[PDB]
Amino acid sequence: NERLRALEDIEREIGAILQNAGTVILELSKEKRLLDRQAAAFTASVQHVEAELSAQIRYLTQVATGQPHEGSSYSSRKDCQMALKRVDYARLKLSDVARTCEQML
Amino acid sequence: ERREIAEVNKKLKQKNQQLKQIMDQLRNLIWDINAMLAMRN
Numbered sequence: 001n002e003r004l005r006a007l008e009d010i011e012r013e014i015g016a017i018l019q020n021a022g023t024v025i026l027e028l029s030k031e032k033r034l035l036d037r038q039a040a041a042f043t044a045s046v047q048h049v050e051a052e053l054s055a056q057i058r059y060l061t062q063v064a065t066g067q068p069h070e071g072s073s074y075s076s077r078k079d080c081q082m083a084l085k086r087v088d089y090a091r092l093k094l095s096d097v098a099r100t101c102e103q104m105l
Numbered sequence: 106e107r108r109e110i111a112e113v114n115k116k117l118k119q120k121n122q123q124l125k126q127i128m129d130q131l132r133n134l135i136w137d138i139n140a141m142l143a144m145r146n
Contacts, residue, residue: 104124
């Protein structure tokens with residue numbers, strides 16, 4: 001969940017206030033309130049987002065030639081479903097025996 | 106007379122045959138592992 005949480009954080013921080021910070025210098029229309037928006041969300045947010053993007057870019061780069069990140073690809077998960085099928089068949093047989101017993105009443 | 110005896114005997118025989126059919130079904134419904142113990146765990 002590490003990479004998933006990192007991607008979620010990057011997505012939530014993708015729409016930073018840098019794109020909306022283009023109306024911060026015009027806040028001085030009362031004297032020669034929210035003037036603090038021109039400092040924290042002017043360029044520091046964009047700088048942090050770019051730093052995070054660069055960090056995410058420089059990963060291990062595992063995938064080189066073929067098909068990595070496998071892990072099912074194989075055995076008795078199939079036979080696990082088969083055992084579930086055996087459980088179902090036993091259920092059917094128990095139901096037939098119960099019907100026979102009911103008829104035996 | 107032995108008519109009631111014969112009637113009870115016939116009823117018991119019918120019940121025995123019914124129980125035998127139930128047991129016959131139970132045989133197949135109860136093996137249930139012999140066919141598939143080759144890959145059971």
